[PDB]
Amino acid sequence: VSILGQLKPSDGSTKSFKRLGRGPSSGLGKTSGRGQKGQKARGKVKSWFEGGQTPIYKLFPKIGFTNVGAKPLKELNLKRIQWFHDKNRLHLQPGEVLDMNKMRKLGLVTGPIKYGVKILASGKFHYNLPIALEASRASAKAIAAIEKAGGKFTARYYTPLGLRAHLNPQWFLEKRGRVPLQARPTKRRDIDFYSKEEKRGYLVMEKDKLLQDIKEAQNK
Amino acid sequence: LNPLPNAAIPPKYALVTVRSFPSLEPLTFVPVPTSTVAAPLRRDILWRAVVYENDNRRVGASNPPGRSENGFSRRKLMPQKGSGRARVGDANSPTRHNGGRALARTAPNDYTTELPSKVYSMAFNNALSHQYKSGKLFVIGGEKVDLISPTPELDLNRLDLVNTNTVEGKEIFEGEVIFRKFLEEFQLKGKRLLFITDKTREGLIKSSDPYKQKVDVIQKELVEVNDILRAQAVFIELEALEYLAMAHQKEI
Amino acid sequence: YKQYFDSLPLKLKSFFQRYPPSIKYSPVSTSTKAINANPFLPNKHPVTQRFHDPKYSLRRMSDVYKLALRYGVEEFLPPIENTKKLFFEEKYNKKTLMKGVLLP
Amino acid sequence: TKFLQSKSGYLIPDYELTTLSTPLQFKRYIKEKILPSANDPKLAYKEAEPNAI
Amino acid sequence: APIFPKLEDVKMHELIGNNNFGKKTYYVERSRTGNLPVYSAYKNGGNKIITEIRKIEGDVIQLRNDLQEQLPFIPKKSWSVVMQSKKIIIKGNAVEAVKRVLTKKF
RNA sequence: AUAAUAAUAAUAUGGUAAUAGAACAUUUAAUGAUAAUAUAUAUUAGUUAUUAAUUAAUAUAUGUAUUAAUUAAAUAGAGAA
RNA sequence: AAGUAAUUAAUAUUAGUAAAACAAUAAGUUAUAAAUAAAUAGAAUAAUAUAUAUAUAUAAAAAAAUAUAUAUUU
RNA sequence: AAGUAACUUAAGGAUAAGAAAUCAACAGAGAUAUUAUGAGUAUUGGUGAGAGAAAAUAAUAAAGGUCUAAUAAGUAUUAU
C-alpha cells in the first residue's frame, strides 16, 4: 500500500488544543476556565490595566530621545576574520583590501549592512593577518592589533546610497549602465572623524582634496 | 590510539535503469546520487510536506451566515419585561432556530500554511527514495546518455505515444491501444499511475484520458510530494528526474 | 548602425525623432517661433513677451540626458548649458562645496 | 541483470540491482522473493493489504 | 558539476549495498560552511542546557558508545539518542569536547 | 541503555474554582482491500474492567462501505439559559 | 444553540538548517555584543576577575551594576 | 468612534490618479495606481486612550509619454 495512509508527525511535535465548554469530566466544563462571575468571566479587563494605581508605564518618568541621525553600525570582531582564515574561508588575493563588498560577499558579516561596519577587537591576541582592512571605523585596540599583525586599516566614509553601491556595484550597472560616485562627507562631525589620524580616517590617510579645500577656505 | 574505530565513508550513487517507454526495456544504468533516490525514509518530514500541500490546496468556501450576514430586521421581537416569556432581541440570534450562526466563518477561508524550502526539498527527495526502494520508480530515457543496449524499433526514449492524433479507419486510435497493451503487460490496470514528463506530451495525455481516474500525467515543475506518494508506480523522464534532483539538492 | 540606433531606449529615440541633430539648437533662450529653439530652455514668446515653459520639462530632459550618457549620444542632443542641471562626473568636479562644509 | 530479467519474465527492482554484488546473491534473492509467490498465487504479495499473513 | 555522472567513472564501492556501511558503522557529515554539527541548546527557558549532535549517517548507538569511551568523564546516563531524527543529546555544555573527539575522523 | 506484557517490594491514587496528561463517539479530506455467506440500522440476549466496540437471533433496507487504520479539518458530543 | 477567525507579539515542544537562519533577483527580518538618555566609546598589553567593556566619575585608577575572555568560535 | 453610517447630487464603464514647482541630499531618482518590505519606525497624543508616514527595495502592470496651451494674478505669498 502507499505510505500516504500511514504518516505521523514526529513525537513531541503536535498537541491536543484545550477544548472548553464541553462537559464536566472534560475538566474545562461549564465555566470553561473563566473562574466565576466577574468581568474577565464575560469580557476582558485591559491587558495593561492596573485597577487604579497609576499604570506603571505612567508612574516612571519619560526618558531619552531617538537620535534620528544615528546610523547604527554592525560589528565584525577580529576573532571572526581569524575564524574565516583558519577555515580558509577569507578567500583573498595578495592585496584585495578587505572592504565591505568583499566582507558581506565572503560572508563574514551578512544580512543587512544598512549604515556600515565597525571592526572590534574580541580576538586581538590570536589575530595575525597581514591583509589590509577597510570599514566604516575600527576600535583603537583592533587597529593596534591589525598594525601589529602587519596589516593596514582605513576608516572609509559611506553615505547609505554610496555604501549600497559599494556592496552591490553590478546591480547599478545593470539598471543604469553606471555605478554612482562616492559622496563627500557633508556633515561636520563626519568630516572631523575622518580627519583624525588616530581613527585612521581616509581623508588624512589618503590626503584628500576636500580637507585641503577646507584648509584653503579657513586661510582665506 | 584509535579514536573512532567504526567511522567510515557512506555510499554515494544508486543505479537506476534507463528504459524505453511503451515496453519498459533496460537500456542503461544511470548512477543517481544516494541523497535523491536512497535517503533514509523519514516519515515525519514526509508528513509535514503532505499536510502543508493539502493546506495549500484548500478552497475554503465555508460561508455560513452570522447574525449580521443573516437577513432579519434589527427590531426587538418582544419588550424586555411584561411579556411572560424569556428575553429576546432581534431574530438573528444563534439561540433561535431561524437565526444566524455563532462564530460564523466567512468567504475565502485562508488555510495556507508555510514550510521551510529546505524541509520541503528533503521531503521531496525522501518520497522519491521511498518509491525507488518499493520498486515503483521507472526512469525512461536514453536520448542524452550513452547507451549499453540499443533502443527498440517500435519504442522511443521519451515518454510519449506515436500517432495518437491520427484516427482514419475507425473512431478507435492507436496510442490508446498501445497504452492498454502496456497496462496489460505490466499488470497495473486498476493501479494508480503517475507520468512525470519534462515537456508537454499531448499524445500521452490523450492516450491516458480513458484511464484518467487512475493515471495522472504531470510536468516536471508541477509534480508534488502527494502525487509521488499516492502513485502505485511513477514513470519519470530521465531529464525530468535530473531536473528534480537539481532542484531539491542540498546546496554547497 | 541603423540597427544599433533602433536598439536605443524608447524615450531617447522619440526625442531624436522630434528634435533631430541636424538642427543646431541654441545654447541661450530664444524666440518660441524660432527653428533652433532649445526644448530644454524656457523660450520667450515674441508677441506676448512671456517665457514659455521648456518643451521638455526638467525631469524628462534629465532622463533623456542620462540615456544619452549611457549610450554615448550626448552631443547629438541640444545643449544643456543654460539649464542649471549638471550630471554625474562633471557635476561632481565643477561644484563648489557648501558654505557650511568649508566654513562651519 | 538485464539478461536474467528477460529469461525470468520478472523485474528485479533497481535498489536490489544496486545492492546485490554477485550472481549467487541474485539467485538467492530470486529464491526468497519471487519463486514462492509464483508457486502459490494466494501466497503472493497484495498491494492494498501489505501486512497480510 | 554534472548531477548524474557517467556509468564508467562510478566505482562499485561507491554504490549502495557495498562496503557494509549499515552494520555497526557510521558517518557524521559537516555543515554547509564546513564545521562539526555539535550545538549547545538552552531548553526549558535557559534552565536546561544540552549538547546536540546532528547529521549522523548509519548506526547512532555505536557512535554514542564510541563517544562515551572517548569521554569517560561524562556519565553513562546522560546520553539520550533520539532515534527518529538520529541525533545524540548530552546533558551538559559538552560541545567542545565532542568536537575535539570527532575532528580527527570527521 | 529500548519497548510489550508479566512478577516481587514500597509510596500514592476525595475534590469546587483551576493546572496538566491521555483517550473515545460524531462529520469531512488524503491513502484503501472487502461483499446481500456482505454491509448499514434497530430490539433483545450475550462478551470485552464496558462513554465504546463485538457476538448471536431477529426486522428493514442496500449488490453496497471515504469501510479498518494514519494523519489532517472540524458547525466534533446538551437535563439545564 | 455557544472559546472562533484575521493580523501581531511572546513561551514551549518537535522537525529542518546552523554561526548562521529566512528568503533567494534583489530587499528585508532575527541572531551574530554588552551597553549608554546620546555622541566619534567597545570587551586578557602575561590569564578568571585581582584582566578587560560600557555607564557615573576621572590624570589614570578604585567604587555599583551589567557584560567579556579558562583542539576549538556562540 | 469617523469623514464611518446615514441623507443629497452627479458621471462612466469603470471612475479616480497620472507625466513632477515630486522626493531627496552634495549621491541621486524620474507619471499614476495596488501590494509586500521599510515599520508599528520617525512623528504624534487630557505625551492617556490611542493614532502613524516617506525615502528606498522589490512585486503587479501598459506603447507609456504627450501637446491641447500664443504659459497663466486677484493667483504666488501674506494675515487671519
From Swiss-Prot, chain B:
Region annotation Disordered: where it falls in the sequence: 57-104
InterPro entries, per the entry: Ribosomal_uL4, Ribosomal_uL4-like, Ribosomal_uL4_dom_sf
GO BP terms, alphabetized: mitochondrial translation
A GO MF label: structural constituent of ribosome
A family per Pfam: Ribosomal_L4
GO cellular component: mitochondrial inner membrane; mitochondrial large ribosomal subunit; mitochondrion
Keywords: Mitochondrion, Ribonucleoprotein, Ribosomal protein, Transit peptide
Localization annotation: Mitochondrion
Record bears the keyword Ribonucleoprotein: yes
Keyword Lyase in record: no
Signal peptide start-end: none
PANTHER family, sorted: 50S RIBOSOMAL PROTEIN L4, LARGE RIBOSOMAL SUBUNIT PROTEIN UL4M
Subunit structure: Component of the mitochondrial large ribosomal subunit (mt-LSU). Mature yeast 74S mitochondrial ribosomes consist of a small (37S) and a large (54S) subunit. The 37S small subunit contains a 15S ribosomal RNA (15S mt-rRNA) and 34 different proteins. The 54S large subunit contains a 21S rRNA (21S mt-rRNA) and 46 different proteins.
Function statement: Component of the mitochondrial ribosome (mitoribosome), a dedicated translation machinery responsible for the synthesis of mitochondrial genome-encoded proteins, including at least some of the essential transmembrane subunits of the mitochondrial respiratory chain. The mitoribosomes are attached to the mitochondrial inner membrane and translation products are cotranslationally integrated into the membrane.
Record-stated family: Belongs to the universal ribosomal protein uL4 family.
Additional remark text: Present with 1200 molecules/cell in log phase SD medium.
Gene: YML6
From Swiss-Prot, chain C:
Subcellular location: Mitochondrion
Superkingdom of this protein's organism: Eukaryota
MF terms (GO), sorted A to Z: structural constituent of ribosome
One Gene Ontology biological process: mitochondrial translation
UniProt keywords, alphabetically: Mitochondrion, Ribonucleoprotein, Ribosomal protein
Principal location class: mitochondrion
Gene Ontology CC terms, in alphabetical order: mitochondrial inner membrane; mitochondrial large ribosomal subunit; mitochondrion
Chain coiled-coil ranges: none
Family (UniProt): Belongs to the mitochondrion-specific ribosomal protein mL59 family.
Other noteworthy facts: Present with 1550 molecules/cell in log phase SD medium.
Assembly description: Component of the mitochondrial large ribosomal subunit (mt-LSU). Mature yeast 74S mitochondrial ribosomes consist of a small (37S) and a large (54S) subunit. The 37S small subunit contains a 15S ribosomal RNA (15S mt-rRNA) and 34 different proteins. The 54S large subunit contains a 21S rRNA (21S mt-rRNA) and 46 different proteins.
Described purpose of this protein according to its UniProt entry: Component of the mitochondrial ribosome (mitoribosome), a dedicated translation machinery responsible for the synthesis of mitochondrial genome-encoded proteins, including at least some of the essential transmembrane subunits of the mitochondrial respiratory chain. The mitoribosomes are attached to the mitochondrial inner membrane and translation products are cotranslationally integrated into the membrane.
Protein name, UniProt field: Large ribosomal subunit protein mL59
Species of origin: Saccharomyces cerevisiae (strain ATCC 204508 / S288c) (Baker's yeast)
Residue range from the parent sequence: 3 to 106 of 157
Curated annotation (Swiss-Prot), chain D:
Coiled coil, from the record: none
Compartments reported by the entry: Mitochondrion
Signal sequence range: none
Transmembrane segment boundaries: none
Its biological purpose: Component of the mitochondrial ribosome (mitoribosome), a dedicated translation machinery responsible for the synthesis of mitochondrial genome-encoded proteins, including at least some of the essential transmembrane subunits of the mitochondrial respiratory chain. The mitoribosomes are attached to the mitochondrial inner membrane and translation products are cotranslationally integrated into the membrane.
Record's miscellaneous remark: Present with 1350 molecules/cell in log phase SD medium.
Family: Belongs to the mitochondrion-specific ribosomal protein mL50 family.
Subunit structure, interactors included: Component of the mitochondrial large ribosomal subunit (mt-LSU). Mature yeast 74S mitochondrial ribosomes consist of a small (37S) and a large (54S) subunit. The 37S small subunit contains a 15S ribosomal RNA (15S mt-rRNA) and 34 different proteins. The 54S large subunit contains a 21S rRNA (21S mt-rRNA) and 46 different proteins.
Protein name: Large ribosomal subunit protein mL50
Protein source organism: Saccharomyces cerevisiae (strain ATCC 204508 / S288c) (Baker's yeast)
Gene: MRPL13
From-to range in the entire protein, with total length: 160 to 212 of 264
Curated annotation (Swiss-Prot), chain E:
Record bears the keyword ATP-binding: no
Source organism, top-level taxon: Eukaryota
Main location as per UniProt: mitochondrion
GO cellular component: mitochondrial inner membrane; mitochondrial large ribosomal subunit; mitochondrion
Keyword Mitochondrion applies: yes
GO molecular function list: structural constituent of ribosome
Homology family: Belongs to the mitochondrion-specific ribosomal protein mL49 family.
Function: Component of the mitochondrial ribosome (mitoribosome), a dedicated translation machinery responsible for the synthesis of mitochondrial genome-encoded proteins, including at least some of the essential transmembrane subunits of the mitochondrial respiratory chain. The mitoribosomes are attached to the mitochondrial inner membrane and translation products are cotranslationally integrated into the membrane.
Leftover remarks: Present with 1700 molecules/cell in log phase SD medium.
Protein name, UniProt field: Large ribosomal subunit protein mL49
Natural source organism: Saccharomyces cerevisiae (strain ATCC 204508 / S288c) (Baker's yeast)
Species classification: Eukaryota, Fungi, Dikarya, Ascomycota, Saccharomycotina
Residues included from the entire protein: 41 to 146 of 146
